[PDB]
Amino acid sequence: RVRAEQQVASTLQTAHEQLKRERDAVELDLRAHVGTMSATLASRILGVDL
Amino acid sequence: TIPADDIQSAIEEYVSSFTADTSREEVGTVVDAGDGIAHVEGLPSVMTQELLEFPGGILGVALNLDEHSVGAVILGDFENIEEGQQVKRTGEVLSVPVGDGFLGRVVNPLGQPIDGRGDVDSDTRRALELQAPSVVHRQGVKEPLQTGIKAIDAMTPIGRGQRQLIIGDRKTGKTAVCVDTILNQRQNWESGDPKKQVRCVYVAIGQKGTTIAAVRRTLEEGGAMDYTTIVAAAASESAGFKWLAPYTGSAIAQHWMYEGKHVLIIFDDLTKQAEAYRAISLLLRRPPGREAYPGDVFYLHSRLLERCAKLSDDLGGGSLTGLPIIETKANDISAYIPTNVISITDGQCFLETDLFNQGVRPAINVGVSVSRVGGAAQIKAMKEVAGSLRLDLSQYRELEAFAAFASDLDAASKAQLERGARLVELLKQPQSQPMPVEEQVVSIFLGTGGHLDSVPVEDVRRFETELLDHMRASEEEILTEIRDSQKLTEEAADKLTEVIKNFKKGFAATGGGSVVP
Amino acid sequence: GQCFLETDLFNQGVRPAINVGVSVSRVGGAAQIKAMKEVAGSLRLDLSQY
Amino acid sequence: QGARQVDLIRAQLTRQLRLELGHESVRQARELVRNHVADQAQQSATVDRFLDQLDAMAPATADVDYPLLAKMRSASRRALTSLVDWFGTMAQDLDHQGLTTLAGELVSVARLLDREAVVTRYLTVPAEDATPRIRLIERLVSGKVGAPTLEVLRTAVSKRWSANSDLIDAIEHVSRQALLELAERAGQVDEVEDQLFRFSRILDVQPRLAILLGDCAVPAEGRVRLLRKVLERADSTVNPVVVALLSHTVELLRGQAVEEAVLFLAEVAVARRGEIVAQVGAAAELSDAQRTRLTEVLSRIYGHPVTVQLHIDAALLGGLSIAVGDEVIDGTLSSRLAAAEARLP
Amino acid sequence: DTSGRVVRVTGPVVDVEFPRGSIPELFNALHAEITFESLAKTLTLEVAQHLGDNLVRTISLQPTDGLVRGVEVIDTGRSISVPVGEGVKGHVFNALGDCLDEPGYGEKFEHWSIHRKPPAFEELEPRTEMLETGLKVVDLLTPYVRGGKIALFGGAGVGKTVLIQEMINRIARNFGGTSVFAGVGERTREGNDLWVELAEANVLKDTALVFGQMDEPPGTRMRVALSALTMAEWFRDEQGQDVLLFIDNIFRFTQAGSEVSTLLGRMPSAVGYQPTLADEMGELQERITSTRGRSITSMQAVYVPADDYTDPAPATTFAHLDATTELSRAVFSKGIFPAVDPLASSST
Amino acid sequence: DTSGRVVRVTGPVVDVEFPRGSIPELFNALHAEITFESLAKTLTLEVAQHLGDNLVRTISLQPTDGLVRGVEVIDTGRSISVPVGEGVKGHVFNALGDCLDEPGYGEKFEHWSIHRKPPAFEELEPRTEMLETGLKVVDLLTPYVRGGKIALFGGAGVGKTVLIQEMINRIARNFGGTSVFAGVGERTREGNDLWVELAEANVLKDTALVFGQMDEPPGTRMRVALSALTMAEWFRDEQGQDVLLFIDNIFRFTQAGSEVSTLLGRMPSAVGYQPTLADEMGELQERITSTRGRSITSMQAVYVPADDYTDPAPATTFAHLDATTELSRAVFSKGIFPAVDPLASSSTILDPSVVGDEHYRVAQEVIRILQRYKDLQDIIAILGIDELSEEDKQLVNRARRIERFLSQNMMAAEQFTGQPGSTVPVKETIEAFDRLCKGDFDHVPEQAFFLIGGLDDLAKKAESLGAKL
Numbered sequence A: 001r002v003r004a005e006q007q008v009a010s011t012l013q014t015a016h017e018q019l020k021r022e023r024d025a026v027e028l029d030l031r032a033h034v035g036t037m038s039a040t041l042a043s044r045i046l047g048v049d050l
Numbered sequence B: 001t002i003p004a005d006d007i008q009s010a011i012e013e014y015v016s017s018f019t020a021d022t023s024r025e026e027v028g029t030v031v032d033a034g035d036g037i038a039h040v041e042g043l044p045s046v047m048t049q050e051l052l053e054f055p056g057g058i059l060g061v062a063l064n065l066d067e068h069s070v071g072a073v074i075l076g077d078f079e080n081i082e083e084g085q086q087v088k089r090t091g092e093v094l095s096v097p098v099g100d101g102f103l104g105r106v107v108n109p110l111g112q113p114i115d116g117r118g119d120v121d122s123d124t125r126r127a128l129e130l131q132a133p134s135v136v137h138r139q140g141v142k143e144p145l146q147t148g149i150k151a152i153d154a155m156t157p158i159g160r161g162q163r164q165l166i167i168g169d170r171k172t173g174k175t176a177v178c179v180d181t182i183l184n185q186r187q188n189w190e191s192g193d194p195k196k197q198v199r200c201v202y203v204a205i206g207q208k209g210t211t212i213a214a215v216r217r218t219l220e221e222g223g224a225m226d227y228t229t230i231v232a233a234a235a236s237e238s239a240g241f242k243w244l245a246p247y248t249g250s251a252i253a254q255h256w257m258y259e260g261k262h263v264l265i266i267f268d269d270l271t272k273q274a275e276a277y278r279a280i281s282l283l284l285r286r287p288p289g290r291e292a293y294p295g296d297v298f299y300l301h302s303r304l305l306e307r308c309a310k311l312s313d314d315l316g317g318g319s320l321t322g323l324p325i326i327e328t329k330a331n332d333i334s335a336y337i338p339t340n341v342i343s344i345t346d347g348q349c350f351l352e353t354d355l356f357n358q359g360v361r362p363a364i365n366v367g368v369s370v371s372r373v374g375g376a377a378q379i380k381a382m383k384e385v386a387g388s389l390r391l392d393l394s395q396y397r398e399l400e401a402f403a404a405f406a407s408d409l410d411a412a413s414k415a416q417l418e419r420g421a422r423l424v425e426l427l428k429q430p431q432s433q434p435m436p437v438e439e440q441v442v443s444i445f446l447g448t449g450g451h452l453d454s455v456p457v458e459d460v461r462r463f464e465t466e467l468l469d470h471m472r473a474s475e476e477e478i479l480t481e482i483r484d485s486q487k488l489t490e491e492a493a494d495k496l497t498e499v500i501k502n503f504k505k506g507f508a509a510t511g512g513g514s515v516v517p
Numbered sequence C: 001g002q003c004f005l006e007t008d009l010f011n012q013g014v015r016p017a018i019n020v021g022v023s024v025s026r027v028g029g030a031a032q033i034k035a036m037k038e039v040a041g042s043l044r045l046d047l048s049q050y
Numbered sequence D: 001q002g003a004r005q006v007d008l009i010r011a012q013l014t015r016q017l018r019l020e021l022g023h024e025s026v027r028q029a030r031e032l033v034r035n036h037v038a039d040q041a042q043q044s045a046t047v048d049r050f051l052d053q054l055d056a057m058a059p060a061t062a063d064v065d066y067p068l069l070a071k072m073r074s075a076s077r078r079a080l081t082s083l084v085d086w087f088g089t090m091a092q093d094l095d096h097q098g099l100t101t102l103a104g105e106l107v108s109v110a111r112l113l114d115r116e117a118v119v120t121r122y123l124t125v126p127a128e129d130a131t132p133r134i135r136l137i138e139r140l141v142s143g144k145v146g147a148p149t150l151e152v153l154r155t156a157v158s159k160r161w162s163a164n165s166d167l168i169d170a171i172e173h174v175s176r177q178a179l180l181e182l183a184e185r186a187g188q189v190d191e192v193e194d195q196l197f198r199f200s201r202i203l204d205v206q207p208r209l210a211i212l213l214g215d216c217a218v219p220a221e222g223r224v225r226l227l228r229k230v231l232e233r234a235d236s237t238v239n240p241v242v243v244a245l246l247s248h249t250v251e252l253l254r255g256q257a258v259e260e261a262v263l264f265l266a267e268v269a270v271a272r273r274g275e276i277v278a279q280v281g282a283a284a285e286l287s288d289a290q291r292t293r294l295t296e297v298l299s300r301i302y303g304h305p306v307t308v309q310l311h312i313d314a315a316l317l318g319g320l321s322i323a324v325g326d327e328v329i330d331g332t333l334s335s336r337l338a339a340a341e342a343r344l345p
Numbered sequence E: 001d002t003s004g005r006v007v008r009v010t011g012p013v014v015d016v017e018f019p020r021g022s023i024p025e026l027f028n029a030l031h032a033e034i035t036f037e038s039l040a041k042t043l044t045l046e047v048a049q050h051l052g053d054n055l056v057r058t059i060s061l062q063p064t065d066g067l068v069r070g071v072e073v074i075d076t077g078r079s080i081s082v083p084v085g086e087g088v089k090g091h092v093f094n095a096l097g098d099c100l101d102e103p104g105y106g107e108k109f110e111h112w113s114i115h116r117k118p119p120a121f122e123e124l125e126p127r128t129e130m131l132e133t134g135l136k137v138v139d140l141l142t143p144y145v146r147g148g149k150i151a152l153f154g155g156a157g158v159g160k161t162v163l164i165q166e167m168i169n170r171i172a173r174n175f176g177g178t179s180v181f182a183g184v185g186e187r188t189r190e191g192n193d194l195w196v197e198l199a200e201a202n203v204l205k206d207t208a209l210v211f212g213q214m215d216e217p218p219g220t221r222m223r224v225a226l227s228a229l230t231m232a233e234w235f236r237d238e239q240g241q242d243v244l245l246f247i248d249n250i251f252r253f254t255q256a257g258s259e260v261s262t263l264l265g266r267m268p269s270a271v272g273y274q275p276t277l278a279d280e281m282g283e284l285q286e287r288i289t290s291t292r293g294r295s296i297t298s299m300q301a302v303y304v305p306a307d308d309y310t311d312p313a314p315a316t317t318f319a320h321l322d323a324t325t326e327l328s329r330a331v332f333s334k335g336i337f338p339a340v341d342p343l344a345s346s347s348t
Numbered sequence F: 001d002t003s004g005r006v007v008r009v010t011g012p013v014v015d016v017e018f019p020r021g022s023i024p025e026l027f028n029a030l031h032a033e034i035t036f037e038s039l040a041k042t043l044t045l046e047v048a049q050h051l052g053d054n055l056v057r058t059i060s061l062q063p064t065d066g067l068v069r070g071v072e073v074i075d076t077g078r079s080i081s082v083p084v085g086e087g088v089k090g091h092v093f094n095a096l097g098d099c100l101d102e103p104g105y106g107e108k109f110e111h112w113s114i115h116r117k118p119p120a121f122e123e124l125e126p127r128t129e130m131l132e133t134g135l136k137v138v139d140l141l142t143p144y145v146r147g148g149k150i151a152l153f154g155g156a157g158v159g160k161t162v163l164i165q166e167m168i169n170r171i172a173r174n175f176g177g178t179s180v181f182a183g184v185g186e187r188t189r190e191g192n193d194l195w196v197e198l199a200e201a202n203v204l205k206d207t208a209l210v211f212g213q214m215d216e217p218p219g220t221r222m223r224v225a226l227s228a229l230t231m232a233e234w235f236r237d238e239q240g241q242d243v244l245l246f247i248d249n250i251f252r253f254t255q256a257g258s259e260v261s262t263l264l265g266r267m268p269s270a271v272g273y274q275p276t277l278a279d280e281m282g283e284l285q286e287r288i289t290s291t292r293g294r295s296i297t298s299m300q301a302v303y304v305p306a307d308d309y310t311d312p313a314p315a316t317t318f319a320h321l322d323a324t325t326e327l328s329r330a331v332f333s334k335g336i337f338p339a340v341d342p343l344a345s346s347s348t349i350l351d352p353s354v355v356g357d358e359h360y361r362v363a364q365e366v367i368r369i370l371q372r373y374k375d376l377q378d379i380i381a382i383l384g385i386d387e388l389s390e391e392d393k394q395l396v397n398r399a400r401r402i403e404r405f406l407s408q409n410m411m412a413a414e415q416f417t418g419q420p421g422s423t424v425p426v427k428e429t430i431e432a433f434d435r436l437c438k439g440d441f442d443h444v445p446e447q448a449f450f451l452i453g454g455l456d457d458l459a460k461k462a463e464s465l466g467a468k469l
C-alpha cells in the first residue's frame, strides 16, 4: 500500500510540475487570438458584420 | 500535455454563437433584505416556489406571496443583496439536472458540482416537487435490500421500496450503518445486472465539510463511488440549501427509479433540514407551533419520504429505498420531529449510547427496533435461520437479571441464558465490514442451530470470523448455492454441520480449552 | 466562583450550609495567606471525595 | 487514484485559464465597443436596429395604471371610482378661478383633515346613513367655502372607505383632477407633462434638497416656502398650474418621498388623458423619426396609446431600454456586454 | 363576474378576494387553477375564515406550488362533497371523492356534503346495546357496543389487518351491512397493501376505501374522516344498513387539525394541540351513532403520544370510546388468533 | 452630503436613514459620534438589515449611552477590518483591531475584512493525526487531532478555562508555529491572567490575543471571534505555518447573537434562540478549519447552559468537531479533575487503524467497565454493594480505581491544590490502564489513584498509604 501511495504522491507532484509547464506556455500562446473572435461577438452583439 | 487551442477555440465557439436577443422581461425591486430573506415589490406573474434571479447570479425562491411584496429565500451570497436592486423572473420552479453522469460526483442542492472535476453531463432536468407515485402505481415490497449488517438484515429487514428510519442520540453509529449499507452494494454493482444493481444517493445536510470529505473517502476506499452520488449542503451553506438538499437528492434517483432501476437514498440528519426550514419559516414570519416549527414540517418530511416507492411492473418495476437519519436528544423519541418521522416511515432502528458503550456495536436496540415489512423483505435462508432469533433474545433479556444465579435456574432457563449471550455476541460487527447474505445466513446458522454452545462467549466473534474464512477458502459451494438458490436445503445444512464440526476440532479457544461437543 | 448554600445541609446542622461539592473559588491560593494555603491545601477535594 | 487526481487538477486550472481568457477577451470586446461607441451616426444606426427588433415582437394586453386606485383595497376602489367620475360631472360647470379656488379650498380642507385625525375617524366610520356625517362636515365648514366643494365633500364622506387617510387623499386626488382639468381648458396639457417630468429629473438626482422638502415635522408651508424660492428662481417653468400642483403635494406630503411623489403626479397627469407612460434610457438623444417609431410600435405592443420619457446616459453605451408598468425591454449594449460576461463557460 | 382572485399565497394558506356580493360561505370549496405544465392541476381551496374587506382565508387541499396571484377562483356553492350510494363499494377514493383506481368514476353519483350535523336529540337511542359479533373473546370479555366506538391497539405483525377483514366479513354477513375504511394519514405502501389484500380476500366488494395519505397537506388529512363518515352516513340513513367504519389512526386526524390550526395563525392550547381539539373530536365522533334502528359502529386505531394516556389527544379521544381491543404479540406467538389480549382489553 | 441620520436607538440596535442611492451594503461599518463630554466616543455600527424606505438597521459595537437622534452617520464603505501579519504576534487587540497594551500600534499594517467565505469543498481533507497532550483521560479516551477541531464542552464552572490553559501550556509552549487566542465574552480578570501568564512563559511573542469580554455590548461579542479568526486565517493562507487557534467560550458568540435577535425583529425559535442559530454557527465554524497543506489546530471551550447537553447551542456545536471532551458536574462533585465524563466524550481518531489496536482495545475496555459501574450505581446505593455478584463486586472495585486514575494533577491547577502537575506519555497510559482493567492493582486502596501521574507515582503514593502494586 505505501509503495503504491508514495509512487502516486510524487507521480502527481512532478506531474503538477509538467501541468504548470504546459500551463504558462499556453497562457501566452493563447493571446494571438484575443483579436479574432472578439471581433466575432463584437458584431454578433451589434447586428452588423463589422 | 494540455489541450491548448482546444481551450481557446472552445470559448470562441461559445462567444461567436452568443445570441441573446432583447426579450421583454417582468422585473421587480428589492425593498428590504435581512438574515437571508429578501422582499421584492413587483413581479405580478411570479408563482409560488419560483426561482428568481438577483443581480450577480444570486438565486432566490419565491415562498411568500401577498399584495405588497414577494418574500424570497436567498440561495447563497446573501450579503450582496441591497434595497433597490432589480430582480428578474425565471418562469421556472426549482428543478435539477438528472442523469447517469451524477455517479461519483459531489453536487450542490442545485446540481452544480462542488468537487471540481468539471461539469456534469446531464440527461434531462427534473422538477423538485413532482408528485409521488399513485396508490395504484405501486407494488408490494418483496425484494430485500441487504445492508450487510446482521442485526438489521436479520431482525429488522429492509425491502426495496421501504422507508427505514435510523434514529439515535449522537455518536451512536447511524452514519456508519448507512455507509455500510452503501458499501454492501459493491458486489451487486459488480454483477452488471440492472435488476440487481443498486445506485446510491447520499444526502449530507448541515454537516461539516471535512465530515463529508471523510464519508466520501470511506466510500472511495470501498470502491463504492462508481454508483454513489453525494448531494452536499454543508453547514456553511444557506438555510435554503439545507432545506432543498434532500429534494435535490430525491429528484435525482427518481429519474433512475422511473427508468426501471433500483436506488437507495440516505437523508443524513433530516433534523437539520427541519431546523433549516424552521429558520426559513420564522424569518418569513409564518405562525410557529410546537417547538417553533412552522406547522407544515410534517408535510415537509412526509412529502419527501413518500417518494420512496416500489413501482408496479407497468411503470418499469424500479424502486427507491429511503434511509432517513434522525438525531435525538437524550433518547427523547417523543420529541416533535422524531415523532413525525417515526409516524411516516415503515420501520425504525433505534441506536443507543448505553448499548454502544457496553460493546454492542452496531448499537441497535433489537427490543424496540421494528420493520413493518418484515419477512417479505428476506430470502428463504435468512427467513428460516433468523425466525428463531427474536424470541431467543427476548428470553435472554428477561433472564439476564438471573445471570448471577444460574445455579438456581431450571435447565431450559440456563440454556436460554447461555444461548442469548452467544447470540448477542453474534450480532456484533466491526465497522466498514459488511457481509453478504450467505455469510450472514451461515453465521446466524451457527447461532441458532446450537453450534456455539461449546465456544466461550468471549470467543464467538473470532470463532465465527475464522469459520467464515475457512468456508470462503475451502467450502465455497455452500455459500455459492445459498447465494444462487436463496434457500438452505437440508443437504447443504448437513454439509455445513460437518464443516462446523471439523473446524471445531481444529479451533483453539483463548483459555486453551476445547470447543468440541 | 460561588458558595452554594442548601436547605438540606442547613437542616442537617451544617452551618454555613455551603455545599462543598459544587462550591468553588476561581482565584484559589492567591486569595489566601501562605499559612492557610499550605494548611488548607486540598481541603475541598478531600471533602468532596469524602 | 493518482491517475484520477492529477487529471482532476489538469481539468481544474485548464478551466481556470479557459474562463480567464474568456473574460479578458470579452472586456477587450468592450474596449472595441467603445471605439465603435464614439461617433453618433452608429449610435442611432443601432437604435434603429433595436427599434426594428421591437417592430417584430408585439403584442401584450397590459393594464392602465389608475395610480391611487392600484394602492386601494376593496370598497375604497368603488368609492374613489364613482367619486372621481362624479367630479368629472362637476368640473363641467365651472370656470378658471372657479376650480383654482376649488384647489385653494380643498387643499386646506385636506390640511385640516390630516392634522386633526380625530374627527377624520368620525367622518370615516362606514355606518350607513351619512346624514349625521354630512351634517358634521357642513356644520364644520359651510361658511368656510364655496358650494361645490362642500357639495362633493358630502359626496366624499358619503361613500364608505377602507382606511382613514384614504379619504384625505381621495379629496387630494380630486384636487389634482380639478387643476389638471383647468390646464386642459387652457390647452396646456402637453407642456404641463413635460414640465412635470423634466422637474422630476430636476429633483430626484438632487436628493439633498429633495430630502429637505421631506421634513414633515417642519410646518408645511415652510417647504413650499423654499420651493417657490427655487422654482421662480427663473420662471421658464413657464406654467403656473405646475406650481399649484406640486405646491399642493408639498402641502400634503405626509412623509412620502418627493422624488417619487412628483413623478406619481406626472403619471396621474398622463393617466387622466388615458395613456400609459413609458420611461426610456439611451446614450444620446433621438430623432423625432426615432420618437415616431418608438411611440408608434410600443403603442402597437401595449395595445394602448403611449407617451415617452428620456433619461440620456452615455454609460449605457448605445441601444435603448424601456420600462413600462413594471416590465422591461433592455437592448442597451451595456446590458448585453454584462450578459456576455455573465454567461461565460 | 362573480368570481374571486388570489391575493396571498403563504404555503397551503391562500387568501382570495371576491366581489362585494359574492363572498362564499364558510367551508365552501373553491377551485383555482395551476397552469404551469409541470405542476398543472386544479387546487381545491376550503374557505376557513372571513377576513373582512371581501377577503377570505382558505386552506388548500393540494400543494400550492406554481400558484400565481390574481388567477381566477371559481366558487362551487357548497362544501367538499363526496359521492354517495352503493356504487362507492369496491373502489378507493380520496378526501375529495375522486376515485383513485378508476379516475372519473362517481362523477355522476349523488354527492353529499361532508359537513353534517349529528342526529337530533329526539332521534338518539337512550338504551345502549351490545353488538354480537360472533367471536368468543369479543362477545365474552370485551362486548362491543352497537353504534359505539372501539379503540384498536394492535401493533405490527399481530394480525390487525386480519381482524379488520374479519369484522368486514362479519358485518357483511351476520348483519347484512357494509364497511367504510378511512385511512387518515395512510401510508401509500400500506394503502396499496390493504387494497390488494381486500381484493384477494374478496371483501373489497363489501368495503369503500377513503384514503387521505401522508404526502398531502393537512387539509385532506383532516377532512378524510368526514368523507368516509359521510359515505357511512348515507349507507345508514338512506340505504338503511348497519355500517362499520374503520378510522385508522384517529390521532392523525387530531394532528392534522393541530397543523391546520397552526397554519391559520391560531394561538396554541395546552401541550400544543388546537384550542378547539375537544370540539373537533366531538363533531367527528358524535355522528358515529345509532339512529332509527340502524347503526354506525366504529373501530378506531389510536396512537398514544409518549405512551401518555393523559395527553390531550388520547384523553380527548377516549371520552368517546366505548370498548378497547389490544392485540398482543405474546398471544400471536402462541398461535391464538385473533390475538386479543384478554386481560388488557376492556369494555364499558 | 451622502451621510446618514440616526432615527431610532433602542439599546444596542440603531436605525439610520441615508439619502436615496447611498444605502450602505450589508455588514458595512458606519461611524457615529457621542459628544457628551464624559461619554464622548465614536460608535461603530455594523449594518445588519435593510429595512426599506432607505432605513438601515445596525448593531453598535460600543454602548450607545449618550447617542442622539438625528446625528450624522458616516459610511466607511467597507466592513470591519482588523490588522493582519507577523506584527500582531505579541499584542492584545479589541474586536475592532485596536491594540490595547499599545494604542495606535498596527494602524499601518495590512487590514483584512472580518467577513470571509469558508474554504471551498475541494480544499478540504480529513485530518487523522494524533496530537499527544500528556493527560491520561484525553490521550486515552478522546485523542486530540493535530490540525483538527477540538472542544471542551462544559457547564458553568467545571474545568473549561483551567483545561484550556493546561492545553496552552502543553501544546503551545513547545509549538513550532503561531498561536491565536480569542477570548469571546469571558471574564476580564481571566484575560489579564492569561496575558501575564503568556508574558512570563515567553509564549506571548508567538501569540496574538484578541479580547471582547462580558462587559461589552452584544456586537463586540458577536464579532470578536471573527476578528481573531481573520488573524488566524491570514496566518494560515498567506504565511502558511501551523496555526493554533484557541477560543474561550465560542458559546458567547451564539448568546450575543440571541441577545439582539428580537431587537432586529426576528421571531424566536425553540429555546429563545435566534431562528438563524445553526446557520450563523456554520458560517463561523466552517472558517475555523484546515485546508489541504495548511493546518489550523482549533480548540474551543463550549459553555453548556445549565448543564443541559440537549440545549440547542451545544447540540448544534457538536456537529462541527473531531474531538469533544465533555466535562460533567457529576464528576466535578466527586473531586475528579479534569472532570471529564468518559462515557460522553468522543473522538473520530479513536479508531483501530489510527491509534493502533492496543490503544483501542484498552479504551473500549475502560469504557465498558465504567458503563457497567454506572449501571450498577443505583442498585449499590439502595440495596448495598453486598447484593451484587462477585463478578460485579470485582468490576465495581476496578471501576472505582479506574475513575480515580483518570484524574490527574494538571500544571494549570497548581493554584487550586499547591501540588505541581505531571505528564504521562501515551504508551505509559495504555500500559497502566491495561493493567488496571486486567486487575493488577485490586489490592492498592481507592486513593493513591487520586490526582497522580503515571505508574511510578502510583507506586509512591501506594507506599505512602501502606501497599505494594
Ligand SMILES: Nc1ncnc2c1ncn2[C@@H]1O[C@H](COP(=O)(O)OP(=O)(O)OP(=O)(O)O)[C@@H](O)[C@H]1O
Binding pocket: B168, B169, B170, B171, B172, B173, B174, B175, B176, B177, B361, B362, B429, B430, B431, F347, F348, F350, F351
Ligand atoms: N460497528 C461499529 N463498531 C465499532 N465502532 C463503530 C461502529 N459504528 C460506529 N462506530 C464508531 O462510532 C463513532 C460514531 O460513529 P458515527 O459517526 O457513525 O455516529 P453518528 O450517528 O454519525 O454520530 P454524529 O452524527 O453525531 O457524528 C465513530 O467514530 C465510529 O468509529
Ligand SMILES: Nc1ncnc2c1ncn2[C@@H]1O[C@H](COP(=O)(O)OP(=O)(O)O)[C@@H](O)[C@H]1O
Binding pocket: C024, C025, C026, C027, C028, F154, F155, F156, F157, F158, F159, F160, F161, F162, F163, F337, F338, F410, F413, F416, F417
Ligand atoms: N484540575 C483541577 N484541579 C483543581 N481545581 C480545579 C481543576 N479544574 C477546575 N478546578 C476548579 O474549578 C473552578 C472553575 O474552573 P473553570 O475551568 O475556570 O470553570 P469554567 O469551565 O466555567 O471556566 C476553578 O476555580 C478551579 O478552582
Ligand SMILES: [Mg+2]
Binding pocket: B174, B175
Ligand atoms: Mg453522522
Ligand SMILES: [Mg+2]
Binding pocket: F160, F161, F186, F249, F301
Ligand atoms: Mg471559562
